[PDB]
Protein backbone atom coordinates (compact mmCIF):
# COMPACT_ATOMS: atom_id res chain seq x y z
CA UNK A 1 0.00 0.00 0.00
CA UNK A 2 0.89 3.65 -0.52
CA UNK A 3 1.18 5.27 2.91
CA UNK A 4 1.53 8.60 4.69
CA UNK A 5 3.30 8.22 8.04
CA UNK A 6 5.74 10.04 10.34
CA UNK A 7 5.25 13.27 12.28
CA UNK A 8 2.06 15.06 11.16
CA UNK A 9 0.20 18.16 12.31
CA UNK A 10 -3.54 18.76 12.61
CA UNK A 11 -3.35 22.37 11.47
CA UNK A 12 -5.31 25.07 13.24
CA UNK A 13 -7.34 27.32 10.94
CA UNK A 14 -6.66 31.01 11.74
CA UNK A 15 -9.44 33.57 11.35
CA UNK A 16 -9.27 37.32 10.76
CA UNK A 17 -12.51 39.35 10.80
CA UNK A 18 -14.47 36.10 10.70
CA UNK A 19 -12.85 34.80 7.51
CA UNK A 20 -10.00 32.36 6.98
CA UNK A 21 -6.69 34.25 7.13
CA UNK A 22 -5.20 32.59 4.06
CA UNK A 23 -1.80 34.29 4.38
CA UNK A 24 -1.49 33.23 8.01
CA UNK A 25 -2.55 29.70 7.05
CA UNK A 26 0.25 29.41 4.48
CA UNK A 27 2.79 30.97 6.85
CA UNK A 28 1.89 28.45 9.59
CA UNK A 29 2.47 25.71 7.11
CA UNK A 30 6.06 26.30 6.04
CA UNK A 31 6.76 26.86 9.76
CA UNK A 32 5.66 23.23 10.11
CA UNK A 33 7.71 22.32 7.02
CA UNK A 34 10.80 24.08 8.35
CA UNK A 35 10.60 22.28 11.72
CA UNK A 36 10.79 18.67 10.56
CA UNK A 37 7.11 17.80 10.09
CA UNK A 38 6.45 15.01 7.56
CA UNK A 39 2.82 15.76 6.67
CA UNK A 40 0.11 18.32 7.39
CA UNK A 41 -3.62 17.69 7.87
CA UNK A 42 -5.72 20.67 6.73
CA UNK A 43 -9.23 20.93 8.20
CA UNK A 44 -9.34 18.08 10.68
CA UNK A 45 -10.99 18.43 14.07
CA UNK A 46 -8.25 20.84 15.14
CA UNK A 47 -8.92 22.89 11.99
CA UNK A 48 -12.58 23.54 12.94
CA UNK A 49 -13.84 21.37 10.08
CA UNK A 50 -17.45 21.44 11.33
CA UNK A 51 -17.84 25.22 11.08
CA UNK A 52 -16.02 25.94 7.83
CA UNK A 53 -18.13 26.06 4.72
CA UNK A 54 -17.47 23.47 2.04
CA UNK A 55 -15.87 26.28 0.03
CA UNK A 56 -13.52 27.33 2.86
CA UNK A 57 -12.65 23.68 3.55
CA UNK A 58 -11.58 23.32 -0.08
CA UNK A 59 -9.63 26.59 -0.03
CA UNK A 60 -7.63 25.38 2.97
CA UNK A 61 -6.83 22.09 1.21
CA UNK A 62 -5.59 24.02 -1.83
CA UNK A 63 -3.38 26.29 0.29
CA UNK A 64 -1.83 23.25 1.99
CA UNK A 65 -1.13 21.55 -1.36
CA UNK A 66 0.40 24.70 -2.86
CA UNK A 67 2.60 25.37 0.17
CA UNK A 68 4.03 21.83 0.26
CA UNK A 69 4.99 21.63 -3.43
CA UNK A 70 8.73 21.23 -3.88
CA UNK A 71 9.16 19.69 -0.40
CA UNK A 72 8.88 16.19 1.02
CA UNK A 73 5.97 17.22 3.22
CA UNK A 74 2.73 15.43 2.30
CA UNK A 75 -0.83 16.73 2.52
CA UNK A 76 -3.25 14.35 4.26
CA UNK A 77 -6.48 16.27 3.68
CA UNK A 78 -9.35 16.18 6.13
CA UNK A 79 -12.36 14.81 4.26
CA UNK A 80 -14.76 13.46 6.90
CA UNK A 81 -18.52 13.88 7.20
CA UNK A 82 -21.54 12.32 8.87
CA UNK A 83 -22.93 11.96 5.33
CA UNK A 84 -21.26 9.50 2.97
CA UNK A 85 -22.15 11.57 -0.09
CA UNK A 86 -20.40 14.60 1.44
CA UNK A 87 -17.34 12.58 2.47
CA UNK A 88 -17.06 11.16 -1.06
CA UNK A 89 -17.30 14.69 -2.46
CA UNK A 90 -14.46 15.91 -0.25
CA UNK A 91 -12.36 12.82 -1.07
CA UNK A 92 -12.74 13.39 -4.81
CA UNK A 93 -11.91 17.08 -4.39
CA UNK A 94 -8.76 16.28 -2.43
CA UNK A 95 -7.66 13.78 -5.09
CA UNK A 96 -8.35 16.11 -8.02
CA UNK A 97 -6.59 19.04 -6.31
CA UNK A 98 -3.34 17.25 -5.55
CA UNK A 99 -3.56 16.02 -1.96
CA UNK A 100 -1.33 13.05 -1.17
CA UNK A 101 -4.06 11.25 0.79
CA UNK A 102 -7.12 11.83 2.92
CA UNK A 103 -8.08 11.52 6.58
CA UNK A 104 -11.73 10.67 7.17
CA UNK A 105 -13.34 10.82 10.63
CA UNK A 106 -15.96 8.24 11.58
CA UNK A 107 -19.43 9.73 10.88
CA UNK A 108 -20.48 11.80 13.88
CA UNK A 109 -23.91 12.31 15.49
CA UNK A 110 -25.81 9.68 13.45
CA UNK A 111 -24.07 6.65 15.02
CA UNK A 112 -23.87 4.22 12.07
CA UNK A 113 -23.54 0.52 12.78
CA UNK A 114 -20.34 -1.37 12.00
CA UNK A 115 -21.93 -2.49 8.73
CA UNK A 116 -22.71 1.13 7.92
CA UNK A 117 -19.17 2.21 8.80
CA UNK A 118 -17.82 -0.45 6.45
CA UNK A 119 -20.07 0.71 3.59
CA UNK A 120 -19.24 4.38 4.34
CA UNK A 121 -15.49 3.86 4.12
CA UNK A 122 -15.72 1.43 1.20
CA UNK A 123 -17.59 4.09 -0.83
CA UNK A 124 -14.96 6.70 0.11
CA UNK A 125 -12.03 4.40 -0.73
CA UNK A 126 -13.52 3.32 -4.07
CA UNK A 127 -13.99 6.97 -5.12
CA UNK A 128 -10.27 7.89 -5.24
CA UNK A 129 -6.93 6.22 -5.88
CA UNK A 130 -4.98 7.93 -3.09
CA UNK A 131 -4.33 6.60 0.45
CA UNK A 132 -7.13 6.79 3.00
CA UNK A 133 -6.52 6.89 6.76
CA UNK A 134 -9.46 6.04 9.01
CA UNK A 135 -9.94 8.18 12.10
CA UNK A 136 -11.57 6.93 15.32
CA UNK A 137 -12.48 9.48 18.01
CA UNK A 138 -15.54 8.15 19.87
CA UNK A 139 -15.62 10.90 22.49
CA UNK A 140 -16.45 13.32 19.65
CA UNK A 141 -18.42 11.18 17.17
CA UNK A 142 -20.55 9.01 19.45
CA UNK A 143 -19.46 5.86 17.64
CA UNK A 144 -16.48 3.52 17.47
CA UNK A 145 -14.88 1.80 14.51
CA UNK A 146 -14.26 -1.64 16.01
CA UNK A 147 -10.94 -3.41 15.55
CA UNK A 148 -12.72 -5.98 13.37
CA UNK A 149 -14.15 -3.27 11.10
CA UNK A 150 -10.80 -1.45 10.81
CA UNK A 151 -9.04 -4.71 9.91
CA UNK A 152 -11.73 -5.70 7.39
CA UNK A 153 -11.48 -2.28 5.72
CA UNK A 154 -7.67 -2.44 5.62
CA UNK A 155 -7.72 -5.92 4.08
CA UNK A 156 -10.62 -5.37 1.68
CA UNK A 157 -9.85 -1.86 0.35
CA UNK A 158 -6.56 -1.32 -1.49
CA UNK A 159 -5.99 2.30 -0.41
CA UNK A 160 -7.18 2.17 3.23
CA UNK A 161 -3.82 1.90 4.96
CA UNK A 162 -4.41 2.41 8.68
CA UNK A 163 -6.15 4.39 11.41
CA UNK A 164 -5.65 7.48 13.49
CA UNK A 165 -6.70 6.43 17.02
CA UNK A 166 -7.96 9.01 19.53
CA UNK A 167 -9.60 6.64 22.00
CA UNK A 168 -7.30 6.40 25.07
CA UNK A 169 -7.26 2.62 24.61
CA UNK A 170 -3.80 1.03 24.41
CA UNK A 171 -5.45 -2.41 24.62
CA UNK A 172 -7.09 -1.71 21.26
CA UNK A 173 -3.76 -0.52 19.89
CA UNK A 174 -2.29 -3.90 20.85
CA UNK A 175 -5.35 -5.71 19.41
CA UNK A 176 -5.01 -3.88 16.08
CA UNK A 177 -1.31 -4.48 15.48
CA UNK A 178 -1.29 -8.03 16.88
CA UNK A 179 -3.96 -9.19 14.42
CA UNK A 180 -2.99 -6.99 11.45
CA UNK A 181 0.63 -5.82 11.78
CA UNK A 182 0.72 -4.43 8.22
CA UNK A 183 -1.52 -1.44 8.99
CA UNK A 184 -0.23 2.01 9.91
CA UNK A 185 -1.48 2.85 13.40
CA UNK A 186 -1.26 6.63 13.94
CA UNK A 187 -1.48 8.27 17.36
CA UNK A 188 -4.22 10.86 17.62
CA UNK A 189 -3.61 11.64 21.32
CA UNK A 190 -0.40 13.57 22.04
CA UNK A 191 0.06 12.46 25.66
CA UNK A 192 0.42 8.81 24.60
CA UNK A 193 2.40 9.36 21.37
CA UNK A 194 5.36 7.35 22.64
CA UNK A 195 3.41 4.25 23.92
CA UNK A 196 1.59 4.00 20.59
CA UNK A 197 4.80 4.41 18.57
CA UNK A 198 6.70 1.95 20.79
CA UNK A 199 4.07 -0.72 20.07
CA UNK A 200 4.72 -0.34 16.35
CA UNK A 201 2.66 2.70 15.49
CA UNK A 202 4.22 4.56 12.59
CA UNK A 203 3.30 8.19 13.16
CA UNK A 204 1.28 10.85 14.94
CA UNK A 205 -1.33 13.39 13.91
CA UNK A 206 -0.62 15.97 16.56
CA UNK A 207 -2.21 19.00 18.19
CA UNK A 208 0.85 19.97 20.22
CA UNK A 209 2.96 20.08 17.04
CA UNK A 210 1.12 23.28 16.03
CA UNK A 211 3.05 24.95 18.87
CA UNK A 212 6.11 22.68 19.22
CA UNK A 213 6.68 21.09 15.80
CA UNK A 214 10.39 20.42 16.37
CA UNK A 215 9.76 18.49 19.58
CA UNK A 216 6.99 16.31 18.15
CA UNK A 217 9.09 15.70 15.04
CA UNK A 218 12.10 14.60 17.11
CA UNK A 219 9.98 12.37 19.36
CA UNK A 220 8.47 10.62 16.33
CA UNK A 221 11.74 10.12 14.45
CA UNK A 222 13.55 8.87 17.55
CA UNK A 223 10.78 6.31 18.07
CA UNK A 224 10.69 5.16 14.44
CA UNK A 225 14.43 4.44 14.77
CA UNK A 226 13.78 2.48 18.01
CA UNK A 227 15.66 5.16 19.98
CA UNK A 228 13.05 4.67 22.67
CA UNK A 229 14.98 6.28 25.52
CA UNK A 230 15.15 9.55 23.58
CA UNK A 231 11.54 9.30 22.36
CA UNK A 232 10.22 8.61 25.86
CA UNK A 233 12.19 11.50 27.37
CA UNK A 234 10.53 13.95 24.97
CA UNK A 235 7.10 12.36 25.52
CA UNK A 236 7.58 12.70 29.29
CA UNK A 237 8.77 16.31 29.02
CA UNK A 238 5.76 17.17 26.84
CA UNK A 239 3.15 15.63 29.17
CA UNK A 240 2.30 18.88 30.98
CA UNK A 241 1.70 20.85 27.77
CA UNK A 242 0.04 17.84 26.11
CA UNK A 243 -2.59 17.75 28.87
CA UNK A 244 -3.11 21.51 29.27
CA UNK A 245 -3.84 21.72 25.54
CA UNK A 246 -7.08 19.85 26.38
CA UNK A 247 -8.14 21.74 29.52
CA UNK A 248 -11.01 22.89 27.28
CA UNK A 249 -12.17 21.30 24.03
CA UNK A 250 -9.51 21.23 21.32
CA UNK A 251 -8.76 23.57 19.48
CA UNK A 252 -9.61 26.20 22.13
CA UNK A 253 -6.34 25.75 24.10
CA UNK A 254 -4.02 25.26 21.11
CA UNK A 255 -5.29 28.43 19.43
CA UNK A 256 -4.91 30.23 22.77
CA UNK A 257 -1.29 29.06 22.95
CA UNK A 258 -0.58 30.04 19.33
CA UNK A 259 -1.95 33.51 20.06
CA UNK A 260 0.06 33.83 23.28
CA UNK A 261 3.17 32.80 21.32
CA UNK A 262 2.47 35.48 18.70
CA UNK A 263 1.99 32.89 15.96
CA UNK A 264 -1.53 34.07 15.06
CA UNK A 265 -2.76 37.65 15.09
CA UNK A 266 -6.12 37.28 16.82
CA UNK A 267 -7.68 34.79 19.24
CA UNK A 268 -10.68 34.15 16.98
CA UNK A 269 -12.89 31.06 16.79
CA UNK A 270 -16.07 30.32 14.89
CA UNK A 271 -19.10 29.83 17.13
CA UNK A 272 -19.96 27.62 18.94
CA UNK A 273 -16.25 27.63 19.78
CA UNK A 274 -15.10 30.62 21.83
CA UNK A 275 -12.30 31.91 24.03
CA UNK A 276 -11.28 29.89 27.11
CA UNK A 277 -12.09 30.95 30.66
CA UNK A 278 -9.80 33.55 32.20
CA UNK A 279 -8.48 30.88 34.58
CA UNK A 280 -7.67 28.44 31.78
CA UNK A 281 -6.09 31.19 29.67
CA UNK A 282 -3.71 31.79 32.58
CA UNK A 283 -3.03 28.07 33.07
CA UNK A 284 -2.08 27.69 29.41
CA UNK A 285 0.22 30.73 29.61
CA UNK A 286 1.91 29.31 32.73
CA UNK A 287 2.58 25.86 31.28
CA UNK A 288 3.97 27.38 28.10
CA UNK A 289 6.81 29.03 29.99
CA UNK A 290 8.43 25.66 30.38
CA UNK A 291 8.93 25.10 26.67
CA UNK A 292 11.00 26.66 23.88
CA UNK A 293 8.58 27.76 21.15
CA UNK A 294 10.06 28.26 17.70
CA UNK A 295 9.13 31.43 15.84
CA UNK A 296 8.76 31.95 12.12
CA UNK B 297 -43.50 32.37 26.89
CA UNK B 298 -45.08 30.88 23.78
CA UNK B 299 -44.69 27.12 23.99
CA UNK B 300 -45.12 23.96 21.95
CA UNK B 301 -45.85 20.97 24.20
CA UNK B 302 -47.79 17.72 24.30
CA UNK B 303 -47.33 14.57 22.24
CA UNK B 304 -44.92 15.13 19.35
CA UNK B 305 -43.40 12.84 16.70
CA UNK B 306 -39.82 12.93 15.38
CA UNK B 307 -40.85 12.12 11.81
CA UNK B 308 -38.91 9.57 9.78
CA UNK B 309 -37.93 10.76 6.32
CA UNK B 310 -38.95 8.14 3.71
CA UNK B 311 -36.74 7.79 0.65
CA UNK B 312 -37.62 6.50 -2.81
CA UNK B 313 -34.81 5.87 -5.30
CA UNK B 314 -32.51 7.89 -3.04
CA UNK B 315 -34.69 11.03 -2.96
CA UNK B 316 -37.20 12.23 -0.37
CA UNK B 317 -40.59 10.62 -1.03
CA UNK B 318 -42.59 13.81 -0.60
CA UNK B 319 -46.02 12.21 -1.08
CA UNK B 320 -45.21 9.52 1.48
CA UNK B 321 -43.95 12.23 3.83
CA UNK B 322 -47.24 14.10 3.65
CA UNK B 323 -49.24 10.88 4.01
CA UNK B 324 -47.38 9.91 7.19
CA UNK B 325 -47.96 13.33 8.75
CA UNK B 326 -51.70 13.13 8.05
CA UNK B 327 -51.67 9.77 9.84
CA UNK B 328 -50.02 11.44 12.85
CA UNK B 329 -52.70 14.14 12.81
CA UNK B 330 -55.55 11.63 12.72
CA UNK B 331 -54.18 9.82 15.78
CA UNK B 332 -54.10 12.63 18.32
CA UNK B 333 -50.57 13.97 17.91
CA UNK B 334 -50.11 17.59 19.04
CA UNK B 335 -47.05 18.52 16.96
CA UNK B 336 -44.64 17.04 14.44
CA UNK B 337 -40.87 17.47 14.25
CA UNK B 338 -39.57 17.39 10.66
CA UNK B 339 -35.90 16.52 10.18
CA UNK B 340 -34.74 15.73 13.69
CA UNK B 341 -32.31 12.93 14.47
CA UNK B 342 -34.98 10.39 13.50
CA UNK B 343 -35.44 12.24 10.19
CA UNK B 344 -31.79 11.71 9.17
CA UNK B 345 -31.02 15.42 9.46
CA UNK B 346 -27.27 14.80 9.06
CA UNK B 347 -27.52 13.22 5.60
CA UNK B 348 -30.23 15.35 4.00
CA UNK B 349 -29.01 18.34 2.05
CA UNK B 350 -29.94 21.82 3.27
CA UNK B 351 -32.43 21.98 0.38
CA UNK B 352 -34.09 18.65 1.24
CA UNK B 353 -34.17 19.70 4.90
CA UNK B 354 -36.04 22.86 3.91
CA UNK B 355 -38.43 20.93 1.65
CA UNK B 356 -39.44 18.61 4.51
CA UNK B 357 -40.14 21.60 6.75
CA UNK B 358 -42.39 23.07 4.05
CA UNK B 359 -44.32 19.80 3.61
CA UNK B 360 -44.89 19.56 7.37
CA UNK B 361 -46.17 23.15 7.55
CA UNK B 362 -48.50 22.70 4.57
CA UNK B 363 -49.87 19.31 5.68
CA UNK B 364 -50.58 20.65 9.19
CA UNK B 365 -52.21 23.88 7.94
CA UNK B 366 -55.80 24.11 9.12
CA UNK B 367 -55.33 21.45 11.80
CA UNK B 368 -54.55 22.19 15.39
CA UNK B 369 -51.24 20.36 14.90
CA UNK B 370 -48.07 22.44 15.21
CA UNK B 371 -44.73 22.10 13.43
CA UNK B 372 -41.61 22.21 15.61
CA UNK B 373 -38.92 22.26 12.93
CA UNK B 374 -35.57 20.56 13.37
CA UNK B 375 -32.95 23.28 12.94
CA UNK B 376 -29.75 22.13 14.71
CA UNK B 377 -26.17 22.24 13.47
CA UNK B 378 -22.64 21.97 14.83
CA UNK B 379 -22.09 25.39 13.18
CA UNK B 380 -23.89 28.37 14.70
CA UNK B 381 -24.17 30.10 11.33
CA UNK B 382 -25.95 27.06 9.82
CA UNK B 383 -28.28 26.75 12.82
CA UNK B 384 -29.19 30.44 12.55
CA UNK B 385 -29.90 29.96 8.84
CA UNK B 386 -32.22 27.02 9.51
CA UNK B 387 -33.99 28.91 12.30
CA UNK B 388 -34.64 31.91 10.05
CA UNK B 389 -35.90 29.63 7.27
CA UNK B 390 -38.27 27.85 9.65
CA UNK B 391 -39.63 31.18 10.87
CA UNK B 392 -40.05 32.56 7.34
CA UNK B 393 -41.82 29.44 6.05
CA UNK B 394 -44.40 29.19 8.82
CA UNK B 395 -43.09 26.76 11.41
CA UNK B 396 -44.57 27.22 14.87
CA UNK B 397 -41.17 26.84 16.54
CA UNK B 398 -37.82 25.10 16.25
CA UNK B 399 -35.91 22.24 17.86
CA UNK B 400 -32.14 22.79 17.96
CA UNK B 401 -29.76 19.97 18.97
CA UNK B 402 -26.64 20.81 20.95
CA UNK B 403 -23.72 21.19 18.49
CA UNK B 404 -22.29 17.76 17.76
CA UNK B 405 -18.66 16.69 17.18
CA UNK B 406 -16.89 19.98 18.02
CA UNK B 407 -17.73 19.86 21.77
CA UNK B 408 -18.35 23.54 22.62
CA UNK B 409 -17.88 24.66 26.22
CA UNK B 410 -20.87 25.81 28.30
CA UNK B 411 -20.04 29.43 27.40
CA UNK B 412 -20.01 28.39 23.75
CA UNK B 413 -23.36 26.62 24.07
CA UNK B 414 -24.79 29.75 25.69
CA UNK B 415 -23.57 31.96 22.84
CA UNK B 416 -24.70 29.43 20.22
CA UNK B 417 -28.28 29.31 21.47
CA UNK B 418 -28.41 33.05 22.20
CA UNK B 419 -27.55 33.70 18.55
CA UNK B 420 -30.25 31.26 17.40
CA UNK B 421 -32.88 32.68 19.77
CA UNK B 422 -32.16 36.28 18.76
CA UNK B 423 -32.52 35.45 15.06
CA UNK B 424 -36.26 34.62 15.21
CA UNK B 425 -39.38 35.40 17.24
CA UNK B 426 -40.82 31.86 17.45
CA UNK B 427 -40.28 29.43 20.36
CA UNK B 428 -36.98 27.56 20.60
CA UNK B 429 -36.64 24.16 22.30
CA UNK B 430 -33.14 23.07 23.31
CA UNK B 431 -32.16 19.45 22.72
CA UNK B 432 -29.64 17.49 24.78
CA UNK B 433 -28.50 14.07 23.58
CA UNK B 434 -24.89 13.63 24.78
CA UNK B 435 -24.52 10.07 23.50
CA UNK B 436 -24.78 11.49 19.96
CA UNK B 437 -23.26 14.97 20.27
CA UNK B 438 -20.34 14.38 22.62
CA UNK B 439 -21.36 17.34 24.77
CA UNK B 440 -23.92 18.09 27.47
CA UNK B 441 -25.89 21.28 28.04
CA UNK B 442 -25.68 21.59 31.82
CA UNK B 443 -28.69 22.31 34.01
CA UNK B 444 -27.16 25.72 34.82
CA UNK B 445 -26.73 26.59 31.13
CA UNK B 446 -30.26 25.44 30.23
CA UNK B 447 -31.76 27.50 33.06
CA UNK B 448 -29.67 30.57 32.15
CA UNK B 449 -30.80 30.35 28.53
CA UNK B 450 -34.43 29.91 29.60
CA UNK B 451 -34.18 32.97 31.84
CA UNK B 452 -32.12 35.19 29.50
CA UNK B 453 -33.68 34.44 26.10
CA UNK B 454 -37.38 35.17 25.66
CA UNK B 455 -37.83 32.55 22.91
CA UNK B 456 -36.17 29.61 24.69
CA UNK B 457 -38.88 27.75 26.59
CA UNK B 458 -37.53 24.32 27.53
CA UNK B 459 -35.45 21.28 26.58
CA UNK B 460 -35.87 17.88 24.93
CA UNK B 461 -33.80 15.56 27.21
CA UNK B 462 -32.43 12.33 25.73
CA UNK B 463 -29.86 11.59 28.42
CA UNK B 464 -31.10 8.66 30.55
CA UNK B 465 -30.77 10.92 33.60
CA UNK B 466 -33.91 11.30 35.73
CA UNK B 467 -31.75 12.99 38.40
CA UNK B 468 -31.13 15.80 35.90
CA UNK B 469 -34.85 15.95 35.14
CA UNK B 470 -35.51 16.56 38.84
CA UNK B 471 -32.67 19.12 38.99
CA UNK B 472 -34.16 21.04 36.06
CA UNK B 473 -37.75 21.34 37.26
CA UNK B 474 -36.85 21.76 40.93
CA UNK B 475 -34.75 24.85 40.18
CA UNK B 476 -36.76 26.20 37.20
CA UNK B 477 -40.32 24.84 37.30
CA UNK B 478 -41.49 27.24 34.55
CA UNK B 479 -39.62 25.48 31.73
CA UNK B 480 -41.13 22.82 29.47
CA UNK B 481 -39.16 19.61 29.94
CA UNK B 482 -39.83 17.32 26.96
CA UNK B 483 -39.01 13.62 27.00
CA UNK B 484 -36.69 12.54 24.21
CA UNK B 485 -36.43 8.88 25.35
CA UNK B 486 -39.58 6.85 24.74
CA UNK B 487 -38.98 4.17 27.35
CA UNK B 488 -39.07 6.76 30.16
CA UNK B 489 -41.83 9.01 28.82
CA UNK B 490 -44.04 8.42 31.85
CA UNK B 491 -41.37 9.04 34.56
CA UNK B 492 -40.47 12.33 32.87
CA UNK B 493 -44.11 13.39 32.50
CA UNK B 494 -44.99 12.35 36.06
CA UNK B 495 -42.27 14.68 37.38
CA UNK B 496 -43.90 17.61 35.57
CA UNK B 497 -42.56 17.25 32.04
CA UNK B 498 -45.05 18.62 29.54
CA UNK B 499 -44.61 16.53 26.41
CA UNK B 500 -42.66 13.97 24.41
CA UNK B 501 -40.80 14.03 21.10
CA UNK B 502 -41.16 10.38 20.25
CA UNK B 503 -39.66 7.78 17.93
CA UNK B 504 -42.23 5.11 18.81
CA UNK B 505 -45.09 7.45 17.85
CA UNK B 506 -44.07 7.05 14.19
CA UNK B 507 -45.45 3.50 14.47
CA UNK B 508 -47.98 3.85 17.32
CA UNK B 509 -49.12 7.51 17.36
CA UNK B 510 -52.41 6.73 19.13
CA UNK B 511 -50.63 4.99 22.02
CA UNK B 512 -47.99 7.68 22.56
CA UNK B 513 -50.52 10.50 22.31
CA UNK B 514 -52.86 8.78 24.79
CA UNK B 515 -49.93 8.20 27.18
CA UNK B 516 -49.01 11.89 27.11
CA UNK B 517 -52.59 13.11 27.45
CA UNK B 518 -53.38 10.79 30.38
CA UNK B 519 -50.26 12.12 32.11
CA UNK B 520 -51.02 15.79 31.46
CA UNK B 521 -54.52 15.20 32.85
CA UNK B 522 -52.90 13.64 35.96
CA UNK B 523 -54.18 10.11 35.26
CA UNK B 524 -50.85 8.57 36.18
CA UNK B 525 -52.29 5.07 36.52
CA UNK B 526 -53.35 4.95 32.86
CA UNK B 527 -50.26 6.83 31.64
CA UNK B 528 -47.97 4.32 33.36
CA UNK B 529 -50.06 1.43 32.04
CA UNK B 530 -49.33 2.48 28.46
CA UNK B 531 -45.70 3.27 29.27
CA UNK B 532 -45.32 -0.24 30.71
CA UNK B 533 -47.09 -1.87 27.77
CA UNK B 534 -44.82 0.01 25.36
CA UNK B 535 -41.52 -0.88 27.04
CA UNK B 536 -40.76 -3.85 24.77
CA UNK B 537 -41.26 -1.92 21.52
CA UNK B 538 -39.66 1.23 22.98
CA UNK B 539 -36.47 -0.76 23.67
CA UNK B 540 -36.42 -2.84 20.47
CA UNK B 541 -36.65 0.37 18.45
CA UNK B 542 -33.09 1.07 19.67
CA UNK B 543 -31.53 -2.39 19.15
CA UNK B 544 -29.55 -0.58 16.42
CA UNK B 545 -29.07 3.18 16.13
CA UNK B 546 -32.28 5.14 15.62
CA UNK B 547 -33.81 5.50 13.02
CA UNK B 548 -32.69 2.08 11.68
CA UNK B 549 -35.24 0.08 13.76
CA UNK B 550 -38.15 2.53 13.37
CA UNK B 551 -37.84 2.64 9.57
CA UNK B 552 -37.64 -1.16 9.59
CA UNK B 553 -40.87 -1.31 11.60
CA UNK B 554 -42.63 1.25 9.38
CA UNK B 555 -41.65 -0.85 6.36
CA UNK B 556 -42.77 -4.09 8.04
CA UNK B 557 -46.13 -2.45 8.84
CA UNK B 558 -46.63 -1.45 5.21
CA UNK B 559 -46.45 2.26 6.09
CA UNK B 560 -43.51 3.05 3.81
CA UNK B 561 -42.79 1.57 0.40
CA UNK B 562 -39.13 0.62 0.73
CA UNK B 563 -36.55 0.06 3.47
CA UNK B 564 -34.21 2.81 2.24
CA UNK B 565 -31.64 4.72 4.30
CA UNK B 566 -28.97 7.24 3.35
CA UNK B 567 -25.42 6.05 3.99
CA UNK B 568 -23.81 5.64 6.48
CA UNK B 569 -27.15 4.35 7.75
CA UNK B 570 -28.23 0.97 6.37
CA UNK B 571 -30.53 -1.99 7.00
CA UNK B 572 -30.38 -3.79 10.36
CA UNK B 573 -28.84 -7.21 10.73
CA UNK B 574 -31.03 -10.15 9.78
CA UNK B 575 -31.25 -11.13 13.46
CA UNK B 576 -32.35 -7.65 14.53
CA UNK B 577 -34.80 -7.44 11.60
CA UNK B 578 -36.49 -10.59 12.92
CA UNK B 579 -36.52 -9.31 16.51
CA UNK B 580 -38.22 -6.04 15.52
CA UNK B 581 -40.82 -7.97 13.52
CA UNK B 582 -41.47 -10.29 16.49
CA UNK B 583 -41.95 -7.46 19.01
CA UNK B 584 -44.29 -5.54 16.67
CA UNK B 585 -46.77 -8.45 16.64
CA UNK B 586 -47.87 -7.69 20.21
CA UNK B 587 -49.10 -4.20 19.25
CA UNK B 588 -52.04 -3.00 17.16
CA UNK B 589 -50.66 -0.70 14.45
CA UNK B 590 -52.99 1.91 12.98
CA UNK B 591 -53.17 2.03 9.19
CA UNK B 592 -53.77 5.08 7.02
Ligand SMILES: N[C@@H](CCCC[NH3+])C(=O)O
Nearest residue numbers: 049050052053054057379
Ligand atom coordinates in the same frame (compact mmCIF):
# COMPACT_ATOMS: atom_id res chain seq x y z
N1 LIG C 1 -21.50 21.77 9.61
C1 LIG C 1 -21.48 20.70 8.61
C2 LIG C 1 -20.74 21.15 7.34
C3 LIG C 1 -19.21 21.19 7.39
C4 LIG C 1 -18.65 21.36 5.97
C5 LIG C 1 -17.15 21.61 5.94
N2 LIG C 1 -16.35 20.43 6.40
C6 LIG C 1 -20.84 19.42 9.17
O1 LIG C 1 -20.32 19.40 10.29
O2 LIG C 1 -20.85 18.38 8.51
Ligand SMILES: N[C@@H](CCCC[NH3+])C(=O)O
Nearest residue numbers: 083345346348349350353
Ligand atom coordinates in the same frame (compact mmCIF):
# COMPACT_ATOMS: atom_id res chain seq x y z
N1 LIG D 1 -23.97 16.69 7.05
C1 LIG D 1 -23.99 18.07 7.51
C2 LIG D 1 -25.05 18.89 6.73
C3 LIG D 1 -26.54 18.54 7.01
C4 LIG D 1 -27.47 19.67 6.51
C5 LIG D 1 -28.96 19.33 6.67
N2 LIG D 1 -29.40 19.21 8.09
C6 LIG D 1 -24.24 18.15 9.01
O1 LIG D 1 -24.40 17.13 9.69
O2 LIG D 1 -24.28 19.23 9.60
Ligand SMILES: [Mg+2]
Nearest residue numbers: 068069070098
Ligand atom coordinates in the same frame (compact mmCIF):
# COMPACT_ATOMS: atom_id res chain seq x y z
MG1 LIG E 1 2.64 18.19 -6.39
Ligand SMILES: [Mg+2]
Nearest residue numbers: 079080104105
Ligand atom coordinates in the same frame (compact mmCIF):
# COMPACT_ATOMS: atom_id res chain seq x y z
MG1 LIG F 1 -11.74 14.22 8.91
Ligand SMILES: [Mg+2]
Nearest residue numbers: 302332333334
Ligand atom coordinates in the same frame (compact mmCIF):
# COMPACT_ATOMS: atom_id res chain seq x y z
MG1 LIG G 1 -54.09 17.77 20.93
Ligand SMILES: [Mg+2]
Nearest residue numbers: 375376400401
Ligand atom coordinates in the same frame (compact mmCIF):
# COMPACT_ATOMS: atom_id res chain seq x y z
MG1 LIG H 1 -32.23 19.61 15.71
